[PDB]
Amino acid sequence: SCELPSTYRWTSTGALAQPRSGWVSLKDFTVVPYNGQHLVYATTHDTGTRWGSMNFEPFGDWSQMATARQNAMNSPTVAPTLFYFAPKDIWVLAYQWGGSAFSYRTSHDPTDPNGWSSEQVLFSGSIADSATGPIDQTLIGDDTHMYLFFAGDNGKIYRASMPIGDFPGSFGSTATVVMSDTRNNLFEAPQVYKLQGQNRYLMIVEAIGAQGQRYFRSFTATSLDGEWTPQATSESNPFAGKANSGATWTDDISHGELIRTTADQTMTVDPCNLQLLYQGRDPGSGGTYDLLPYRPGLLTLQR
Ligand SMILES: O[C@@H]1[C@@H](O)[C@H](O[C@@H]2CO[C@@H](O[C@@H]3CO[C@@H](O[C@@H]4CO[C@@H](O)[C@H](O)[C@H]4O)[C@H](O)[C@H]3O)[C@H](O)[C@H]2O)OC[C@H]1O
Ligand SMILES: [Ca+2]
Ligand SMILES: [K+]
């Protein structure tokens, strides 16, 4: 195995796909391996006010993301988390802005954008001092428990848990704060992973830098119910950001996901081959947040 570096150095692609006509952005990627291909769901925004979601047809290599058919979902699953819940042999798509704080649906065929079950409650809690409410869930399981982590655009990261045999189901209405900082330092888009070959878990969180540029900070833990330790936690020393991305097509390195070695709920990633599918936007872009022209990019860690 390969230890996480204390200084990350990446190289980047440019934008890997453009939104199909009618959408201004592709955002908040979730991605699994599927039958030897990449299966990606994403948030969309249209040219008016509508948040939506989509998947890409499975594609074999990252050059094929640009040509993969983009399939709209009839019922949106904004800021989605996709995984295979192996203990009950069912796929799960979790998301926000349905009927409760967080929702999920299930399927046996995650390539079908419109093949998901009816909406179920994932979380029904509220949080304090948040303009948005709970946002950007991520889920991960260990041997005995499933965990829900989320943010609130408020400087806090929250955790709920349930015995793994009780999942899929609702985590209830309460959560535990596991980290807090100034609003901009722990802002949104948390993602939690288990590192292959190591007794260690990795959390990355999106932050807002001094001039508004998005970047990620990282933290580690040795158990998912334990405490989190800063691993790379500033704009000049980030997990991934303009300081170290190798990207100039974007300054932002924002809401996305690490490439995983498995689709299942363990969220396992290979520390020897870390890659981040992120959302970025042209540095000249501006105006109202919801219309910003985000697109996917991929970072590959140098070792
Ligand atoms: O009922 C649902 C609505 O609540 C939901 O509203 C969206 C809620 O999320 C909003 O996106 C948040 C908003 O702002 C971004 O952060 C700002 C970035 O610029 C900074 O200068 C500023 O300080 C920050 O606050 C944050 O990144 C983003 O996640 C979105 O604007 C609302 O449209 O819409 C769906 C309904 O079903
Ligand atoms: Ca996410
Ligand atoms: K967002």
Coordinates of C-alpha atoms and ligand atoms in Angstrom, one line a residue:
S1 CA 0.0 0.0 0.0
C2 CA 0.8 3.7 -0.5
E3 CA 0.5 6.3 2.3
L4 CA -1.4 9.5 1.6
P5 CA 1.0 12.3 0.9
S6 CA 1.2 15.3 3.1
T7 CA 1.6 17.4 -0.1
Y8 CA -0.6 16.5 -3.0
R9 CA 0.4 17.1 -6.5
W10 CA -2.1 16.3 -9.3
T11 CA -2.3 16.5 -13.0
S12 CA -5.7 17.3 -14.6
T13 CA -7.7 16.9 -17.7
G14 CA -9.7 19.7 -19.2
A15 CA -13.5 19.5 -19.3
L16 CA -14.5 15.9 -20.1
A17 CA -18.1 16.6 -21.4
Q18 CA -20.3 19.5 -22.3
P19 CA -24.0 19.5 -21.1
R20 CA -26.4 18.6 -23.8
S21 CA -28.6 21.4 -25.2
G22 CA -31.1 22.7 -22.6
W23 CA -28.7 22.3 -19.6
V24 CA -26.2 24.9 -18.5
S25 CA -24.2 22.6 -16.2
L26 CA -23.3 19.1 -15.1
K27 CA -22.5 18.9 -11.4
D28 CA -22.0 16.9 -8.1
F29 CA -20.8 13.6 -9.8
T30 CA -21.2 10.2 -8.4
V31 CA -19.4 7.4 -10.2
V32 CA -19.1 3.6 -9.9
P33 CA -17.3 0.9 -11.8
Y34 CA -20.0 -1.2 -13.7
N35 CA -19.3 -4.2 -15.9
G36 CA -15.8 -2.8 -16.7
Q37 CA -17.1 0.7 -17.5
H38 CA -17.8 4.0 -15.7
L39 CA -21.4 4.6 -14.6
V40 CA -21.8 8.3 -13.7
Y41 CA -24.9 10.2 -12.4
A42 CA -24.9 13.9 -12.0
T43 CA -26.9 17.0 -11.0
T44 CA -28.2 19.1 -13.9
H45 CA -29.4 22.7 -14.1
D46 CA -31.5 23.9 -17.0
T47 CA -31.4 27.4 -18.6
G48 CA -34.2 28.6 -16.2
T49 CA -34.6 27.5 -12.6
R50 CA -34.8 23.8 -12.6
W51 CA -32.4 21.5 -10.8
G52 CA -32.5 18.0 -12.2
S53 CA -30.4 14.9 -12.6
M54 CA -29.1 12.6 -15.3
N55 CA -26.9 9.7 -16.0
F56 CA -24.4 9.0 -18.7
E57 CA -24.6 5.8 -20.7
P58 CA -21.8 3.6 -19.3
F59 CA -18.5 4.4 -21.0
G60 CA -15.2 2.6 -21.2
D61 CA -12.5 5.3 -20.9
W62 CA -12.5 9.0 -19.9
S63 CA -12.2 10.1 -23.6
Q64 CA -15.6 8.5 -24.1
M65 CA -17.4 10.6 -21.5
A66 CA -17.8 13.4 -24.0
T67 CA -19.7 11.2 -26.5
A68 CA -21.8 9.1 -24.0
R69 CA -25.5 9.7 -24.3
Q70 CA -26.8 12.0 -21.5
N71 CA -30.1 10.7 -20.1
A72 CA -32.4 13.0 -18.1
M73 CA -34.2 11.6 -15.1
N74 CA -37.9 12.1 -15.1
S75 CA -37.8 12.5 -11.3
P76 CA -34.7 14.4 -10.1
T77 CA -32.1 13.0 -7.7
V78 CA -30.0 16.1 -7.0
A79 CA -26.5 15.6 -5.6
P80 CA -26.7 11.9 -5.9
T81 CA -24.8 9.1 -4.2
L82 CA -24.8 5.8 -6.2
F83 CA -23.7 2.5 -4.8
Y84 CA -24.3 -1.2 -4.7
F85 CA -25.6 -2.3 -1.2
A86 CA -24.2 -5.7 -1.3
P87 CA -25.7 -7.2 1.9
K88 CA -29.2 -7.1 0.3
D89 CA -28.0 -7.2 -3.4
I90 CA -29.7 -3.9 -4.3
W91 CA -28.5 -0.7 -5.8
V92 CA -29.1 2.5 -3.9
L93 CA -29.4 6.1 -5.2
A94 CA -29.5 8.7 -2.4
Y95 CA -30.2 12.4 -3.0
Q96 CA -31.6 15.6 -1.7
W97 CA -34.6 18.0 -2.3
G98 CA -37.2 15.3 -2.5
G99 CA -39.8 15.1 0.2
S100 CA -37.6 14.9 3.3
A101 CA -34.1 16.1 4.1
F102 CA -32.6 13.2 2.3
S103 CA -34.1 10.5 0.2
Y104 CA -33.2 7.3 -1.6
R105 CA -34.5 4.9 -4.2
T106 CA -33.5 1.3 -5.1
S107 CA -32.9 -0.7 -8.3
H108 CA -31.5 -3.8 -9.7
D109 CA -30.3 -2.0 -12.9
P110 CA -28.6 1.2 -12.2
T111 CA -27.9 2.0 -15.8
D112 CA -31.6 2.8 -16.3
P113 CA -32.1 6.5 -15.3
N114 CA -35.8 6.0 -14.9
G115 CA -35.7 2.4 -13.4
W116 CA -35.6 3.4 -9.7
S117 CA -38.1 2.6 -7.1
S118 CA -40.4 5.1 -5.4
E119 CA -38.8 7.7 -3.2
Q120 CA -38.0 6.6 0.4
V121 CA -36.9 8.6 3.4
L122 CA -33.2 8.5 4.1
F123 CA -33.1 11.4 6.7
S124 CA -35.7 13.7 8.2
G125 CA -33.7 16.0 10.5
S126 CA -33.2 19.7 10.5
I127 CA -30.0 21.7 11.4
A128 CA -29.2 25.1 12.8
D129 CA -27.8 28.2 11.2
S130 CA -28.1 26.8 7.8
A131 CA -29.4 28.7 4.7
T132 CA -29.8 25.4 2.8
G133 CA -30.6 22.8 5.4
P134 CA -28.8 19.4 5.2
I135 CA -27.0 19.1 1.9
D136 CA -24.7 16.8 -0.1
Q137 CA -25.0 13.5 1.7
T138 CA -22.6 10.6 1.4
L139 CA -23.0 7.1 2.6
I140 CA -20.5 4.4 3.6
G141 CA -20.6 1.2 5.5
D142 CA -18.1 -0.8 7.6
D143 CA -18.6 -4.3 8.8
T144 CA -21.4 -3.5 11.3
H145 CA -22.9 -0.1 10.5
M146 CA -24.0 2.2 7.7
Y147 CA -23.1 5.8 8.1
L148 CA -24.6 9.0 6.6
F149 CA -22.4 12.1 6.5
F150 CA -23.6 15.5 5.3
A151 CA -23.0 19.2 5.4
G152 CA -25.1 22.3 5.8
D153 CA -23.3 25.2 4.1
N154 CA -22.6 26.2 7.7
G155 CA -19.2 25.0 8.7
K156 CA -20.4 21.7 10.2
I157 CA -20.1 18.1 9.1
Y158 CA -22.7 15.7 10.6
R159 CA -22.9 11.9 11.0
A160 CA -25.7 9.5 11.6
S161 CA -25.5 5.7 11.8
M162 CA -27.6 2.5 11.8
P163 CA -26.8 -1.2 12.0
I164 CA -26.0 -2.3 8.5
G165 CA -28.8 -5.0 8.5
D166 CA -31.3 -2.2 9.0
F167 CA -30.3 -0.5 5.8
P168 CA -31.8 0.7 3.4
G169 CA -34.0 2.8 5.6
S170 CA -34.2 6.1 7.3
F171 CA -31.3 7.3 9.6
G172 CA -34.0 9.2 11.6
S173 CA -34.0 12.8 12.5
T174 CA -30.9 13.3 14.6
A175 CA -27.2 13.5 13.7
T176 CA -23.9 14.1 15.5
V177 CA -21.6 16.9 14.6
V178 CA -18.2 15.4 13.9
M179 CA -16.3 18.5 12.8
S180 CA -16.9 22.3 12.8
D181 CA -15.1 25.3 11.6
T182 CA -15.9 28.7 10.0
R183 CA -18.6 28.5 7.4
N184 CA -16.2 28.6 4.4
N185 CA -13.7 26.1 5.8
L186 CA -16.2 23.2 6.0
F187 CA -18.8 24.2 3.5
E188 CA -20.3 21.3 1.5
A189 CA -19.8 18.2 -0.7
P190 CA -18.3 15.8 1.8
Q191 CA -17.2 12.4 0.5
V192 CA -16.0 9.5 2.8
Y193 CA -13.9 6.5 1.6
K194 CA -12.0 3.5 2.9
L195 CA -8.4 3.2 1.8
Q196 CA -7.5 -0.1 0.2
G197 CA -4.7 -2.0 2.0
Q198 CA -4.8 0.3 5.1
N199 CA -6.7 0.7 8.4
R200 CA -7.8 4.2 7.4
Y201 CA -10.7 6.2 6.1
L202 CA -10.5 9.4 4.1
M203 CA -13.0 12.3 4.2
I204 CA -12.7 15.2 1.7
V205 CA -14.8 18.4 2.2
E206 CA -15.3 21.3 -0.1
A207 CA -14.2 24.8 1.2
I208 CA -14.4 28.3 -0.2
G209 CA -11.1 30.1 -0.5
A210 CA -10.1 33.7 0.0
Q211 CA -11.3 34.9 -3.4
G212 CA -14.2 32.5 -3.7
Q213 CA -12.4 29.6 -5.4
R214 CA -13.6 26.1 -4.4
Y215 CA -11.1 23.5 -3.2
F216 CA -11.1 20.3 -1.1
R217 CA -9.6 19.7 2.4
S218 CA -8.9 16.2 3.6
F219 CA -9.2 14.4 7.0
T220 CA -8.6 10.9 8.1
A221 CA -9.9 8.5 10.7
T222 CA -9.2 4.9 11.8
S223 CA -12.9 4.1 12.4
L224 CA -16.0 5.6 11.0
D225 CA -17.4 6.4 14.4
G226 CA -14.1 7.9 15.5
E227 CA -12.6 11.3 15.3
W228 CA -11.3 13.0 12.2
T229 CA -7.7 14.3 11.9
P230 CA -6.6 17.1 9.5
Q231 CA -4.7 15.6 6.6
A232 CA -4.4 18.5 4.1
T233 CA -6.4 21.5 5.3
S234 CA -5.7 24.8 3.8
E235 CA -6.1 26.6 0.5
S236 CA -2.3 26.7 -0.1
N237 CA -1.9 23.1 1.1
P238 CA -5.2 21.5 0.0
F239 CA -6.3 18.0 -0.8
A240 CA -7.1 19.4 -4.3
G241 CA -7.4 23.0 -5.4
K242 CA -5.9 25.5 -7.7
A243 CA -2.7 25.3 -5.7
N244 CA -2.0 21.8 -6.8
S245 CA -4.5 20.6 -9.5
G246 CA -2.5 21.2 -12.6
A247 CA -5.7 22.6 -14.1
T248 CA -6.0 26.0 -15.7
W249 CA -9.3 25.5 -17.5
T250 CA -10.9 26.0 -14.1
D251 CA -9.7 27.5 -10.8
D252 CA -12.5 25.8 -8.8
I253 CA -12.0 22.1 -7.8
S254 CA -15.5 21.4 -6.6
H255 CA -18.2 18.7 -5.7
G256 CA -17.3 15.3 -7.1
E257 CA -16.0 11.9 -6.1
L258 CA -12.9 9.8 -6.0
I259 CA -12.8 6.9 -8.5
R260 CA -13.5 3.7 -6.5
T261 CA -12.2 0.2 -6.8
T262 CA -15.7 -1.4 -6.2
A263 CA -19.3 -0.2 -6.5
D264 CA -20.2 -1.4 -3.1
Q265 CA -21.1 0.4 0.2
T266 CA -17.5 0.1 1.6
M267 CA -16.6 3.1 -0.7
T268 CA -13.1 1.6 -1.2
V269 CA -10.5 3.6 -3.1
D270 CA -6.9 2.8 -4.1
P271 CA -4.4 5.2 -2.4
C272 CA -1.9 4.1 -5.0
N273 CA -4.0 5.4 -7.9
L274 CA -6.1 8.3 -6.5
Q275 CA -8.3 10.0 -9.1
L276 CA -10.9 12.7 -8.5
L277 CA -13.8 13.3 -10.8
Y278 CA -14.7 17.0 -9.9
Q279 CA -16.7 19.8 -11.2
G280 CA -14.9 22.9 -12.6
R281 CA -15.8 26.1 -14.5
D282 CA -14.1 28.7 -16.7
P283 CA -12.4 31.3 -14.5
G284 CA -14.1 34.0 -16.5
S285 CA -17.6 32.7 -15.7
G286 CA -19.8 34.5 -13.2
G287 CA -23.3 35.7 -12.3
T288 CA -25.9 33.9 -10.4
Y289 CA -24.6 30.6 -8.7
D290 CA -27.3 28.3 -10.0
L291 CA -26.4 29.1 -13.7
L292 CA -22.7 28.7 -13.4
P293 CA -21.3 26.6 -16.3
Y294 CA -19.8 23.6 -14.4
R295 CA -18.4 20.6 -16.2
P296 CA -16.6 17.4 -15.2
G297 CA -12.8 17.1 -15.0
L298 CA -10.5 14.4 -13.7
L299 CA -7.4 14.7 -11.5
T300 CA -4.8 12.0 -11.2
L301 CA -2.4 12.0 -8.3
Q302 CA 1.3 12.0 -9.1
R303 CA 3.3 9.5 -7.2
Ligands
LIG1 O1 -36.6 23.5 -2.1 C1 -35.4 23.3 -2.8 C2 -34.6 24.6 -2.7 O2 -34.2 24.8 -1.3 C3 -33.2 24.5 -3.4 O3 -32.6 25.7 -3.3 C4 -31.2 25.6 -3.7 C5 -30.5 25.4 -2.4 O4 -29.0 25.3 -2.7 C6 -28.5 26.6 -3.3 O5 -27.1 26.3 -3.6 C7 -26.2 26.5 -2.5 C8 -26.2 28.0 -2.6 O6 -25.1 28.8 -2.7 C9 -23.8 28.2 -2.9 O7 -22.9 28.9 -2.0 C10 -22.7 30.3 -2.2 C11 -21.5 30.3 -3.1 O8 -21.2 31.8 -3.3 C12 -20.8 32.4 -2.0 O9 -20.4 33.7 -2.4 C13 -22.0 32.4 -1.1 O10 -21.6 32.9 0.2 C14 -22.4 30.9 -0.9 O11 -23.5 30.9 0.0 C15 -23.7 26.8 -2.5 O12 -22.5 26.3 -3.1 C16 -24.9 26.0 -3.1 O13 -24.7 24.6 -2.8 C17 -29.2 26.8 -4.6 O14 -28.7 28.2 -4.9 C18 -30.7 26.9 -4.4 O15 -31.3 26.9 -5.7 O16 -33.6 24.3 -4.9 C19 -34.3 23.0 -5.0 C20 -35.6 23.0 -4.3 O17 -36.3 21.8 -4.4
CA2 CA -21.8 14.0 -3.4
K3 K -24.5 22.6 -4.7

